[PDB]
Amino acid sequence: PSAEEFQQLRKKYTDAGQGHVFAFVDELQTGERSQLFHQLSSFDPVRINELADKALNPPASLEPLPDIATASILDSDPKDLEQWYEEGLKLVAGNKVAVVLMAGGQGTRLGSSAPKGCFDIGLPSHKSLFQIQAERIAKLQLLAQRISGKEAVIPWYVMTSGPTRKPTEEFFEQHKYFGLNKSDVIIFEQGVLPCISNEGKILMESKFKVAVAPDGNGGIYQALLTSGVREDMRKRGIEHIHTYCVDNCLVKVADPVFIGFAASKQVDIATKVVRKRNATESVGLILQKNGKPDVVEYSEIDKETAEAKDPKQPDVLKFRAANIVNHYYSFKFFESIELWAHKLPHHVARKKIPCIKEGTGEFFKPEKPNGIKLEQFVFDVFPMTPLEKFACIEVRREDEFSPLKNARGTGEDDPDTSKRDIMSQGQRWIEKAGGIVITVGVEVSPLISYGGEGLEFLKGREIKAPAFIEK
């Protein structure tokens, strides 16, 4: 970096009212100086000022989704369920189905040292969430072959952040990709935005480093372009994508019912919900806003809409379609990302951000929250999508949604509720297949059963819970 170049960038920053990021250049090594220059060269402080301004100095008709845009597996015609299952498996067997795992979370409520997908919830197998998910992919590729007599590939695109990327890659490598082919698993990274003081100023982590944070799960779309992942999908002939969150231990990865349902309705986007468990559950609610499909995040909803009651049913929530972060896209939808990625709004959250005191140089952790994180949300493409190209499908919580949000000891959405849900699931499947569990719960490996099939061999047999059915 020359003097002219360093000076021209300084000017940009100074003119933008962000000159303080250069206030310790005085006392910097030649390479700490380049760390600062290179990182500042990758932000436009004017767009930073623009974001900071909408966030800090900021400027609906609201009904349930109409029944044309909604379905449920709890009351679908069984002929439909069967047809959707079959079509989903055929699309898997045609190598047209990809999976995008959103694993860009630091997992702050869980306070673990490792990525959340590495977490062992205490199952007898001691498998991670990542491994459980990989094995569902493996098992579904096998089920697909049973009706093609040919290999079935579901590529697995794993989206991480700066914080999770390296440990995620090491973990996958140390487990030999959980038995999948390395060449059908791509680990990529979401982008970042700088953290912002309450007063609009870029926070500095050190005297040579801007404080940045992941740009939210809504960062998926831009990261699909710049990572090369969308191009890999085009190359492989992918036409259908299942996107989910890593923290859900029950997630039906590439669920064939979901895929076949969406593909046969020819939507651009579909999404899963469950019945909200109470007014206060920390879930987005899917609904119709200003004529369009939309989500209100739990952090942005008002008490009155969260607590509104169904007129005919005075104890049931009016808005109870809980977002479980299981989305479908057509590949064609991803072909349009350049035209609307930029229109995704920035959600704001107050944060305690450790930084350099501006003036002192003192690398302090703050008492009250001293700034803000900006995040895009994955579901903010929903109102971009016509009702007729959108579908929402209700599923059963007990089979499809068990999130790991909190640490052992919390009492909900934690490792013990997760463990209990998998093992309770496994016992239900066995009991349906004819087995007898003595006693709690049973862990069924995904390689044995994806979704409750293949357990005939257990008919008549007694199983002493807790148990583990594997190879």
Ligand X SMILES: Cn1ncc(Br)c1N
User: How many CB atoms are located within 10 Å of the residue 409 CB?
Assistant: 8
Q: H or E segment at 293?
A: strand 292-296
d(CA 220, CA 160): 10
Tokens of residue 302, six digits: 């008002």
d(CA 456, CA 411): 35
DSSP calls for 235-262:
HHT--EEEEEETTBTT--TT-HHHHHHH
Instruction: Confirm or deny that 315 is annotated as ligand binding.
Output: no
Map residue 384 onto helix, strand or coil: helix
Check binding of 240 to ligand X (CB under 6 A).
no
Check binding of 418 to ligand GN1 (CB under 6 A).
no
Check binding of 121 to ligand X (CB under 6 A).
no
How many of the chain's residues bind ligand GN1 (CB under 6 A)? 13
> 127, 125, 109, 108: which is closest to 117 by C-alpha?
127
Convert residues 229-268 into a mask of x (bound to Cl ion by CB under 5 A) and - (unbound): ---------------------------------------x
Q: Which of 252, 373, 405, 419 binds ligand A1IIR (CB under 6 A)?
A: 373
Check binding of 330 to Cl ion (CB under 5 A).
no
Q: Which of 385, 402, 417, 418 binds Cl ion (CB under 5 A)?
A: 385
Tokens of residue 35, six digits: 């760390």
d(CA 331, CA 98): 9
Check binding of 394 to ligand X (CB under 6 A).
yes
121 to 180, contacts with ligand GN1 by CB under 6 A? none
How many of the chain's residues bind ligand A1IIR (CB under 6 A)? 7
Cβ closest to ligand A1IIR, residue 330 vs residue 370: 370
Question: Do residues 245 and 100 make contact, with C-beta atoms less than 8 angstroms apart?
Answer: no
Question: Do residues 161 and 218 make contact, with C-beta atoms less than 8 angstroms apart?
Answer: no
Name, in order, each residue with C-beta under 8 angstroms of 11's C-beta and a sequence gap of 6 or more.
none
Check binding of 273 to ligand X (CB under 6 A).
yes
Span of 239-247, 365-373, 388-396, 425-433 interacting with ligand X by CB under 6 A: 388-396
Q: How far is the CB of 84 from ligand X (least distance, A)?
A: 15
Map residue 302 onto helix, strand or coil: coil
Instruction: Confirm or deny that 280 is annotated as ligand binding.
Output: no
Check binding of 275 to ligand X (CB under 6 A).
yes
* Three-state secondary structure string covering 157-187: EEEECHHHHHHHHHHHHHCHHHHCCHHHEEE
Q: Which of 8, 41, 42, 72 binds ligand X (CB under 6 A)?
A: 72
Check binding of 281 to ligand A1IIR (CB under 6 A).
no
Check binding of 65 to ligand X (CB under 6 A).
yes
Span of 160-168, 253-261, 345-353, 357-365 interacting with ligand A1IIR by CB under 6 A: 345-353
Q: H or E segment at 144?
A: helix 129-145
d(CA 15, CA 325): 42
Question: Do residues 424 and 467 make contact, with C-beta atoms less than 8 angstroms apart?
Answer: no
Span of 9-17, 202-210, 231-239, 323-331 interacting with ligand GN1 by CB under 6 A: 323-331
**Residue nearest ligand GN1, Cβ-based:** 284
Q: Which of 242, 272, 327, 347 binds ligand A1IIR (CB under 6 A)?
A: 347
Check binding of 391 to ligand A1IIR (CB under 6 A).
no
Cβ closest to ligand A1IIR, residue 297 vs residue 358: 297
Binding site for Cl ion (CB under 5 A): 268, 385
Binding site listing: 67, 70
Binding site listing for Mg(2+): 67, 70
